[PDB]
Write a protein that binds this ligand. Sequence first.
Ligand SMILES: [Zn+2]
Ligand SMILES: [Zn+2]
Ligand SMILES: [Zn+2]
Lengths: 79, 111, 111, 108, 95, 144, 212, 100
Amino acid sequence: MTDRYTIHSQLEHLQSKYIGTGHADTTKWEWLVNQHRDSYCSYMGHFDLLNYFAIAENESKARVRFNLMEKMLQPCGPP
Amino acid sequence: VPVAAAMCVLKTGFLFVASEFGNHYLYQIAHLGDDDEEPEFSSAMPLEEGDTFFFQPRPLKNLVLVDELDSLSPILFCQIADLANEDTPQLYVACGRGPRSSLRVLRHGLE
Amino acid sequence: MFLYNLTLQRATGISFAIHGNFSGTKQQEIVVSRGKILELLRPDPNTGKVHTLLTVEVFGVIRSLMAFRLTGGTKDYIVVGSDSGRIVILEYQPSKNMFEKIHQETFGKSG
Amino acid sequence: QVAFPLQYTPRKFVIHPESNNLIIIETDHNAYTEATKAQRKQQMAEEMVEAAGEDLAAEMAAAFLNENLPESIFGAPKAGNGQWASVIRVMNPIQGNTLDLVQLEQNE
Amino acid sequence: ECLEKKVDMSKVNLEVIKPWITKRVTEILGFEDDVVIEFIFNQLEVKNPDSKMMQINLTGFLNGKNAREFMGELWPLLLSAQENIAGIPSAFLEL
Amino acid sequence: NRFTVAELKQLVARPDVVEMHDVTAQDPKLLVHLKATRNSVPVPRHWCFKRKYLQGKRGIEKPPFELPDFIKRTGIQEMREALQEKEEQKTMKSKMREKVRPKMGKIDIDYQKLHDAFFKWQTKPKLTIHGDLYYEGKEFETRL
Amino acid sequence: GHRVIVSDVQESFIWVRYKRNENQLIIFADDTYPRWVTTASLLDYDTVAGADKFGNICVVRLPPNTNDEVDEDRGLLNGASQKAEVIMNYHVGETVLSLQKTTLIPGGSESLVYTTLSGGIGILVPFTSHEDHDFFQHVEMHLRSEHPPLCGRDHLSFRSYYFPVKNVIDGDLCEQFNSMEPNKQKNVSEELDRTPPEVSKKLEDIRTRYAF
Amino acid sequence: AKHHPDLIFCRKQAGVAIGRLCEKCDGKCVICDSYVRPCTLVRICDECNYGSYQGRCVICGGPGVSDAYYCKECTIQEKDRDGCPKIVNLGSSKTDLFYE
RNA sequence: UUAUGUAUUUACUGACCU
Ligand SMILES: [Zn+2]
Ligand SMILES: [Zn+2]
Ligand SMILES: [Zn+2]
């Protein structure tokens, strides 16, 4: 069964479908995990931050992209 | 070959490798196919205990180097200095990642 | 106080590299992206060297780059996706020696 | 361009202003210093002549020890995580020769 | 809660299941419809359906008690048939 | 649940910012971390008041406006005050009469003086750095 | 000499004074922006040019007062008190790892030389007079209109990627004046009230003077 | 628009169909809603340009005459790189005035 | 003396509008 969790959506006031915006009741974990995900897509987005990160290890660029890419699922830790 | 970001093998039998750090290269493909000598293995042969198909690395047999295209990436540290007593100064550059790294001296002239 | 940027020896590290009949002839060409730079390279087959034919500054980061051939077509069009919210399809005009921008469609905010 | 090859990733260098010479620090994460390369190769040879050698080929261990692949060609080995190879090189900026070489320790 | 052990409608028959459901909804609202029996049909067409959406859209027509007991009846028949390779629940295997 | 300003002031590396309401937050430690992060500017002072941020400016009468000096050295203030004062004597008879028979060339000052005042004689004003947010008094505390 | 520029890895440049009578190290100025500085170089006794991980180049000049004599609890905005200020921001697209003030050709002049991470090598060159500054500003302001970049990425909003651009003219857009068809060149040059060989002369004079 | 705060935009993906403005609203920007500095054409989605709705005004829904544009101040804020700016609902103005 | 709830004018805003 279930009880009373019927909340499909409501008045389309602004449609903040941009993920990562956040509202008043947004906790520390939520906007820090959006902060880490935006950081990761900007790391692999720019070529040259990915250069800078690949020089610091000896790892190749696809190794660094696969590491950064698999960390985007749960980067900060469990809620 | 050194590790590449992208490869473009060419009809007319070339192989272009773009090393992400250091120099890029263009090879002529000498023995394509290469179905003669080497211990090749496959997918559906019943090999167990992990990988179990190894290979001994070796120097070039299938490619011959033709062109070394030059690059300074990654310029890690640099100096403008006039150490070689020439009139114009010189660029003393650190470059490369790993065992392919190099110090590179740059002048204004021609080869 | 009031400055002026100039590139002396523009960028040489290659992030993406694609190949195809961009000129529209039987021979093939490489199009590479130096990140901020977009360059066309001809692999001169008889002498084996590599000659740059064109180098433009796209003033973006070429996040991805891929060439495609139209169905029943001779020339390949380059296709660039960047930090702008724009797909942009390019054609190498060999006559005027420049990349003619064929189309440019906007789909989202930039960066 | 004229290149003087190096072992690792060169972080920065200074210039001895008297009698102009470059003093370079080379440093790479995930890399063995070559004392550990020699010890790791000797260890490899040891377990290859220990793992059931009764039936035999200790030729394999010796041939493994004395056939050194060029790491600029075949890629340097990568020392797991947290290991750190590093050397210090005094170099002539004219000819580009290793006028002095000082290794460091394994993680230093 | 118990409605969340997932289902795959490829594992189940459906033409044997319909007359039981018709008989149950004739018991629940007294009389016969089609559009809610065809709701059962058309909601259980999709291969991996959802039970919570099922419970909402039957809570609408029915009481909200009868939707609760109806899901607590109908979902274990689906599980008891999808365990079996035959595709038949225990109330129609034994009888 | 809401551990008070004592312990919350004891835990934080910069305790000099934790206030009487920060205990009543929904995440106190990051609030007083971001309150003690480096170059932020704080919430305005009137978030807790009852006076709608400037309805305390009631009875004080203030001067109209000081023009900057490069504009005052064009004589536009004297010409404009002179014709305003001359226009305060007109009736609707002459305000409707000189609507249809207009005397012109009332100001006609010049164009080179105005160009020089905005281009030759331009004065940098006294700006402020990005921290110096505004509260209600703020110019009557000139005592610093 | 008598001043220290400490580059934080995250915030910015922090001016420190070292005393002779005492041995103290007194922070007396910092900058308001977080920057992630990678390398830096001194240009004047006041100014510090630095570069960051993301690609920009900042030049932070101290205000004209900033008296060093501070002997040692409140800060100004959780930091130092004499907030230094920024007199250019510019985006390069690559991480600049070496900034150096030098003169590449004898008979030439000083020019800041940056060597990025992706192999590129550039210079930042001061302007002599306001006629040169205003000319090249109108040149590149015309080229943002007539000659848009290839990806559609807006050139003012590429150079103002992280921080807004300030007092730097992108001469790599300017040196694409020599790459348009001469209809566009005549449009720009008569919009400049010059001729296209005159503009190409005036445009390669700067690279001739300061650099290669 | 900015004047009528209850008007809602369409905001779906912008296709290739160029927006149009009526004769009563020529020169208006669509978002900032002013007259000067038009810089960027309007691309409207395919649902808000289908059949009967072709060449119709973006704002008024009257018969379009000229092409629609964004300001420079909408362009450099990238208010053109959101959805299609086709004002969908007609609410509480030009309805009661029709009943008056 | 900050202040509410309302009956209630007067002013003011949005290049609002046939
Ligand atoms: Zn607008
Ligand atoms: Zn639409
Ligand atoms: Zn209209």
